[PDB]
Design a protein around this ligand. Structure first.
Ligand code: HEM
Ligand SMILES: Nc1ccc(N)nc1
Length: 291
């Protein structure tokens, strides 16, 4: 099962920078969403969930085919809430109808990370929409009520190692859990629409108490009003994860560089890029363009 990247006909860096810019401008404009968190976090989660269906064993799922647009995947219980991200991107797709769905969803996540002052994430075009019957069944995205061994084994299916898993999880500084979406409630820190290494600092420095929420699920709560999922907290229960948590808590630049690599890899799993494919694009932020 081979998915070969195919550049949208005649398109180049400038075309994709325009799509970036439209996403970034709408991120700025539609600022009220989710009690003024804005759409950044949900777009990052959308990019991850459309990628996280991948299975290295047979190359099913993954970002390439854009299959989130089909009802089976759109209505995955694991994807509850992501409809808000898709609705955000609808006017973008209308303005730029030539971009593939997988390119749009993945570019949304890259744009969100960068516009929230995160690391640059190199991004490659050429995902191609595939038919409805290529949509992966529900149940490939991870549960949150589990322990470190679960997390480790889960991410092996995505070809991610301990350092890549701990780096990716730093995205949980962003946005919040919403009780009605996932059965968990609250943010992981204070700056939840700015991309920082706060997730690791909060894991190490807050006083965490294991409580039940209003959906009768356990989660870890701090008196500052932050929360951790059981799978988040597992990163300080397992000694191998804990060492990497401490590394990223103590080195912002290292976290940014490792996140950027892991997130690009996540968004590109399953895709074969021709030797003659364009190099990865690194988009300028609005701020860098004076826009
Ligand atoms: C063991 C792996 C993970 C689990 C179990 C997990 C679980 C969750 C859950 C339950 C939520 C709350 C959804 C809702 O109520 O709205 C959430 C939110 C989020 N997740 Fe994860 N996640 C995992 C990994 C990741 C990864 C790898 C990324 C991306 C690099 C990521 C990005 C996000 C973001 C940005 C949000 C906030 C969304 C919002 O505010 O709307 N997650 N995750
Ligand atoms: N989205 C999110 C926020 C906080 C935590 N701990 N996990 C996930």
């Amino acid at each position: 099962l081979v998915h070969v990247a195919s550049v949208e006909k005649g398109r180049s860096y400038e075309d994709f920078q325009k799509v970036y810019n439209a996403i970034a401008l709408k991120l700025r404009e539609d600022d009220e969403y989710d009690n003024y968190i804005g759409y950044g976090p949900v777009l990052v989660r959308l990019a991850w969930h459309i990628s996280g269906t991948w299975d290295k064993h047979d190359n099913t799922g993954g970002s390439y085919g854009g299959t989130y647009r089909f009802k089976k995947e759109f209505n995955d219980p694991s994807n509850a809430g992501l409809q808000n991200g898709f609705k955000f991107l609808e006017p973008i797709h209308k303005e730029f109808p030539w971009i593939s769905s997988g390119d749009l969803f993945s570019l949304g996540g890259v744009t969100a990370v960068q516009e929230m002052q995160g690391p640059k994430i190199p991004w490659r075009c050429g995902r191609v929409d595939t038919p409805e019957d290529t949509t992966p069944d529900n149940g490939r995205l991870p549960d949150a009520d589990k322990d470190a061994g679960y997390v480790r084994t889960f991410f092996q299916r995505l070809n991610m190692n301990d350092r890549e898993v701990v780096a990716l999880m730093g995205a949980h500084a962003l946005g919040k859990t919403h009780l009605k979406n996932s059965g968990y409630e609250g943010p992981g820190g204070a700056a939840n629409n700015v991309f920082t290494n706060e997730f690791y600092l909060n894991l190490l420095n807050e006083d965490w108490k294991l409580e039940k929420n209003d959906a009768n699920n356990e989660q870890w709560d701090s008196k500052s009003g932050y929360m951790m999922l059981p799978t988040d907290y597992s990163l300080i229960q397992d000694p191998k994860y804990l060492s990497i948590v401490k590394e990223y808590a103590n080195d912002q630049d290292k976290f940014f560089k490792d996140f950027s690599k892991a997130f690009e890899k996540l968004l590109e799993n399953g895709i074969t890029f021709p030797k003659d494919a364009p190099s990865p694009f690194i988009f300028k932020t609005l701020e860098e363009q004076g826009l």
